[PDB]
Amino acid sequence: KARSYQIELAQPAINGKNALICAPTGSGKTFVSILICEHHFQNMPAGRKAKVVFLATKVPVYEQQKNVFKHHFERQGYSVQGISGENFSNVSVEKVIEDSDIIVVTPQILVNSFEDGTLTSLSIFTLMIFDECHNTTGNHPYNVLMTRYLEQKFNSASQLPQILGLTASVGVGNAKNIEETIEHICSLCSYLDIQAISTVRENIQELQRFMNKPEIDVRLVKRRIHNPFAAIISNLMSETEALMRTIYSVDTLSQNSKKDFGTQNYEHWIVVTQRKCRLLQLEDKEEESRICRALFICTEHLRKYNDALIISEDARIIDALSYLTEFFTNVKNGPYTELEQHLTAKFQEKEPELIALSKDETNENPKLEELVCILDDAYRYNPQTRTLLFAKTRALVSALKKCMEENPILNYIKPGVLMGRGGMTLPSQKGVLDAFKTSKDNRLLIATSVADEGIDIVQCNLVVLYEYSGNVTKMIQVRGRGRAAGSKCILVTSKTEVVENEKCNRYKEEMMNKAVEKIQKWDEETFAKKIHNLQMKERVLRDSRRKEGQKNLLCGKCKAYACSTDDIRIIKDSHHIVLGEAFKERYTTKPHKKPMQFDGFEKKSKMYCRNNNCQHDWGITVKYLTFDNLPVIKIKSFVMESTATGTQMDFQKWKSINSSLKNFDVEEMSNLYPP
């Protein structure tokens, strides 16, 4: 049965107005949407029947919500079906929509169906429900769909579906004051054609009985007093930069580094430098290859050292050292050219000293010490605690897992780890979460942002944000993982900037709530005028952007010639194969480590530059239709060279190239083989 605040939240939409339902995670927004659906079904005009679509951004959420809708509505005689990437290829989308009263989807399913001409109008629906609707920005599938809706609205020749958006946070964007915050919220509202914002106003006491906002503890801790590990690695980085400058004057290509080793700024500098180094053009093409390859190696090595410094700041020296020894093992097992041998030798000269450091107990990381004390204190107090420990990077989560496995909390608590997909598969993710829910001693989950929201996780008594910073929306989401009476959320940092960020979040969240209240005081006319003027601005920008050559592909590492754009064919808008016997000379293959079928293709092999001194990954080979071992190239593996000007360019997406490429044609293909 419905809580009073749920009935309250539904009211603006029960009248047929487009509504944005902003309420805390776990407050039952999906149930509110179900109330709205029930009213919708029962009050259609004569001659009409409803057709509802519920959109979710993540597969596990799609699965969760599909089950909820089936259970609620099938018993009332409604057909409820789901489509996601798991079954998209096994079904006809048009046919599922024809046969279903309610369809639950991931939004790309609908985008693909407009793209392929299966669907021609959103007037096929009477109600569209967007879960996590704050994701409606840019080229997100939600905004691709809403752009289509708004184009229909503008043409004013069709009945639009009602729109319902669900979110726990409208956010603040880059706003610094209430005026800017109102503007940000109205922008989000404009993209979804919202007509009213629905929050709990009358039944706040009831809401507060069900939803307890976690108690925050921001703890500022110290760095190590002395940092000999960082000194040794820093010196190796200085030496590597100097070596790089003897190979080629990198300053004529990208600016000189600030030598701010062990920072994200340095990481970014390396990456920008790598981008510039691969585009180096020389008249002597052999020299271009030699220099580009050498610079590729030097920058990769600098990156790994920088990574190790960052790991050492948050975890143990032995975790940083480990990361490096695993890298150097890979280096030894690869092309392992003379430059690679030299860099490896320079590391191995210092490795004894680094090992000795990694064992000295006076070198312990105080931040990690704080973390262990926090966890000890919590489990000692309440042995039934379940904790979610958030950390930013895969490398740090992996290090923390090792720490907590080797040194169990109170000598018995065991960690599980949740990361994003490669990586971990959705089945793997669910397995870890099942164990964390039920296990007697597995009471600690260490996770990246995969755990912020969406996927079902057991409620946690303790949420620890280990150097885990972000915006207002992220802090609202992570809070919702620790939703119970008695729950705590602790942020642990050695950075005064992170403390200040969290202070700003508190202020901004207050600003957001106030902005919403001010908007809610506007009458319908005022609100609609504001949203309309934003939509017309949007349109004028979109329309202006719409009205607004042959290349060789070169190996992105060694600059060897790969193929011509003339040789490429596009399969199903996405997959770029290369035709002809000539290309076969250019690459070599190894069996694919995860040979699987998707999109009608069977993966066979990985494809590499044939140069043993290079071995750069170029893509895969696949079986498709009547053809085996077709090479599928990935654009990020190559540099493009204009045959007209000789100029080299970097493309991270196929968009700007595809226009110039031919589509796959089964007849053309069939002719390239003996009869």
Added chain:
RNA sequence: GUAGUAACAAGAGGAAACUCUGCUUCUGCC
């Protein structure tokens, strides 16, 4: 193959308000 007003920014335009830009970190999706 692709997305994110996410992470971290850094830089460019502007008198300023503020606009544009990332392939890195992380996650999502087909």
